Amino acid sequence: SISLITYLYEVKKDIGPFLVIVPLSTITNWTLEFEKWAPSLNTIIYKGTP
DNA sequence: TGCCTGGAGACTAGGGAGTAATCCCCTTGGCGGTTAAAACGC
């Protein structure tokens, strides 16, 4: 998913908006993977207290 | 104590109830996640 999104965004210069649905207990793994492999793409993740 | 009418016995049948066949929808049990509600204390 990261490779496809990054390739499309680098080719088209259309970084977003993009929406991803991630089930719980995996949000932090996706966050760490995005921070590590693709620092150029930022993400907004909702969690914690209302 | 005497009298009689409501109760009972025999015969007929048809319709409501019992039984089989069919199926899907409402229920039951469980788990995830969130958070407003429940518990404890001064």
PDB file of C-alpha atoms (C1' of nucleotides) in Angstrom:
ATOM      1  CA  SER A   1       0.000   0.000   0.000  1.00  0.00           C
ATOM      2  CA  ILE A   2       2.780   2.444   0.910  1.00  0.00           C
ATOM      3  CA  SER A   3       4.651   1.730  -2.330  1.00  0.00           C
ATOM      4  CA  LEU A   4       1.545   2.166  -4.490  1.00  0.00           C
ATOM      5  CA  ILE A   5       0.527   5.407  -2.760  1.00  0.00           C
ATOM      6  CA  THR A   6       4.038   6.879  -2.874  1.00  0.00           C
ATOM      7  CA  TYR A   7       4.528   5.951  -6.536  1.00  0.00           C
ATOM      8  CA  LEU A   8       1.172   7.443  -7.547  1.00  0.00           C
ATOM      9  CA  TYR A   9       1.819  10.622  -5.546  1.00  0.00           C
ATOM     10  CA  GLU A  10       5.350  11.091  -6.901  1.00  0.00           C
ATOM     11  CA  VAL A  11       4.165  10.530 -10.478  1.00  0.00           C
ATOM     12  CA  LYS A  12       1.040  12.701 -10.332  1.00  0.00           C
ATOM     13  CA  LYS A  13       2.083  15.291  -7.701  1.00  0.00           C
ATOM     14  CA  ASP A  14      -1.301  14.534  -6.101  1.00  0.00           C
ATOM     15  CA  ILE A  15      -0.300  13.668  -2.514  1.00  0.00           C
ATOM     16  CA  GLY A  16      -3.956  13.522  -1.495  1.00  0.00           C
ATOM     17  CA  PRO A  17      -6.443  13.662   0.127  1.00  0.00           C
ATOM     18  CA  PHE A  18      -6.332   9.899   0.769  1.00  0.00           C
ATOM     19  CA  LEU A  19      -8.276   7.817   3.296  1.00  0.00           C
ATOM     20  CA  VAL A  20      -7.082   4.561   4.881  1.00  0.00           C
ATOM     21  CA  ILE A  21      -9.104   2.226   7.108  1.00  0.00           C
ATOM     22  CA  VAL A  22      -6.944   0.380   9.648  1.00  0.00           C
ATOM     23  CA  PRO A  23      -8.433  -1.875  12.359  1.00  0.00           C
ATOM     24  CA  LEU A  24      -7.359  -1.418  15.965  1.00  0.00           C
ATOM     25  CA  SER A  25      -4.247  -3.077  17.443  1.00  0.00           C
ATOM     26  CA  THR A  26      -2.573  -2.333  14.097  1.00  0.00           C
ATOM     27  CA  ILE A  27      -2.739   1.487  14.046  1.00  0.00           C
ATOM     28  CA  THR A  28       0.616   1.880  15.804  1.00  0.00           C
ATOM     29  CA  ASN A  29       2.322  -0.630  13.500  1.00  0.00           C
ATOM     30  CA  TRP A  30       1.105   1.277  10.436  1.00  0.00           C
ATOM     31  CA  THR A  31       2.220   4.521  12.103  1.00  0.00           C
ATOM     32  CA  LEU A  32       5.722   3.160  12.729  1.00  0.00           C
ATOM     33  CA  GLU A  33       5.924   1.757   9.193  1.00  0.00           C
ATOM     34  CA  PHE A  34       4.903   5.111   7.705  1.00  0.00           C
ATOM     35  CA  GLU A  35       7.417   6.957   9.889  1.00  0.00           C
ATOM     36  CA  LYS A  36      10.202   4.562   8.884  1.00  0.00           C
ATOM     37  CA  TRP A  37       9.706   3.780   5.193  1.00  0.00           C
ATOM     38  CA  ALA A  38       8.039   6.992   3.941  1.00  0.00           C
ATOM     39  CA  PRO A  39       8.779  10.104   6.017  1.00  0.00           C
ATOM     40  CA  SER A  40       7.635  12.239   3.062  1.00  0.00           C
ATOM     41  CA  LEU A  41       3.979  11.209   3.558  1.00  0.00           C
ATOM     42  CA  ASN A  42       2.281  12.435   6.727  1.00  0.00           C
ATOM     43  CA  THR A  43      -0.711  10.771   8.356  1.00  0.00           C
ATOM     44  CA  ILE A  44      -3.530  11.894  10.637  1.00  0.00           C
ATOM     45  CA  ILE A  45      -4.580   9.181  13.101  1.00  0.00           C
ATOM     46  CA  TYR A  46      -7.480   9.553  15.536  1.00  0.00           C
ATOM     47  CA  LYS A  47      -7.163   7.736  18.866  1.00  0.00           C
ATOM     48  CA  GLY A  48      -7.193   8.265  22.608  1.00  0.00           C
ATOM     49  CA  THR A  49      -9.519  10.485  24.597  1.00  0.00           C
ATOM     50  CA  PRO A  50     -12.384  12.209  22.732  1.00  0.00           C
TER      51      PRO A  50
ATOM     52  C1'  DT B   1     -93.807 -38.858  49.855  1.00  0.00           C
ATOM     53  C1'  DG B   2     -95.284 -37.921  45.325  1.00  0.00           C
ATOM     54  C1'  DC B   3     -94.341 -35.845  40.837  1.00  0.00           C
ATOM     55  C1'  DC B   4     -91.655 -34.341  36.693  1.00  0.00           C
ATOM     56  C1'  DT B   5     -88.402 -32.173  34.012  1.00  0.00           C
ATOM     57  C1'  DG B   6     -83.717 -31.954  33.488  1.00  0.00           C
ATOM     58  C1'  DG B   7     -80.538 -35.605  32.889  1.00  0.00           C
ATOM     59  C1'  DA B   8     -79.023 -39.710  30.443  1.00  0.00           C
ATOM     60  C1'  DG B   9     -78.419 -43.409  26.545  1.00  0.00           C
ATOM     61  C1'  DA B  10     -78.174 -44.589  21.423  1.00  0.00           C
ATOM     62  C1'  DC B  11     -77.247 -43.014  16.684  1.00  0.00           C
ATOM     63  C1'  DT B  12     -75.374 -39.810  13.106  1.00  0.00           C
ATOM     64  C1'  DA B  13     -71.630 -36.573  11.019  1.00  0.00           C
ATOM     65  C1'  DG B  14     -69.021 -32.784  10.235  1.00  0.00           C
ATOM     66  C1'  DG B  15     -66.086 -29.555  11.428  1.00  0.00           C
ATOM     67  C1'  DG B  16     -62.461 -28.185  14.747  1.00  0.00           C
ATOM     68  C1'  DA B  17     -58.535 -30.276  16.568  1.00  0.00           C
ATOM     69  C1'  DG B  18     -54.454 -33.396  16.235  1.00  0.00           C
ATOM     70  C1'  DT B  19     -50.428 -34.774  13.414  1.00  0.00           C
ATOM     71  C1'  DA B  20     -47.132 -34.753   9.727  1.00  0.00           C
ATOM     72  C1'  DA B  21     -44.390 -31.914   6.330  1.00  0.00           C
ATOM     73  C1'  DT B  22     -41.909 -27.464   5.282  1.00  0.00           C
ATOM     74  C1'  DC B  23     -38.740 -23.235   6.141  1.00  0.00           C
ATOM     75  C1'  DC B  24     -37.031 -19.037   7.434  1.00  0.00           C
ATOM     76  C1'  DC B  25     -36.667 -15.456  10.804  1.00  0.00           C
ATOM     77  C1'  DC B  26     -36.204 -14.204  15.231  1.00  0.00           C
ATOM     78  C1'  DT B  27     -33.491 -15.375  18.901  1.00  0.00           C
ATOM     79  C1'  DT B  28     -29.297 -16.780  21.669  1.00  0.00           C
ATOM     80  C1'  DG B  29     -24.366 -16.526  22.805  1.00  0.00           C
ATOM     81  C1'  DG B  30     -19.965 -14.011  22.091  1.00  0.00           C
ATOM     82  C1'  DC B  31     -16.662 -10.518  21.080  1.00  0.00           C
ATOM     83  C1'  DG B  32     -14.504  -5.314  19.822  1.00  0.00           C
ATOM     84  C1'  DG B  33     -14.423  -0.896  20.711  1.00  0.00           C
ATOM     85  C1'  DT B  34     -15.896   3.402  22.890  1.00  0.00           C
ATOM     86  C1'  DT B  35     -17.594   6.187  26.682  1.00  0.00           C
ATOM     87  C1'  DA B  36     -21.043   7.859  29.359  1.00  0.00           C
ATOM     88  C1'  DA B  37     -22.477   5.890  33.355  1.00  0.00           C
ATOM     89  C1'  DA B  38     -21.443   3.444  37.887  1.00  0.00           C
ATOM     90  C1'  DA B  39     -18.285   3.204  42.521  1.00  0.00           C
ATOM     91  C1'  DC B  40     -15.608   4.797  46.078  1.00  0.00           C
ATOM     92  C1'  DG B  41     -14.125   8.723  49.111  1.00  0.00           C
ATOM     93  C1'  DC B  42     -14.253  13.430  51.564  1.00  0.00           C
TER      94       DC B  42
END
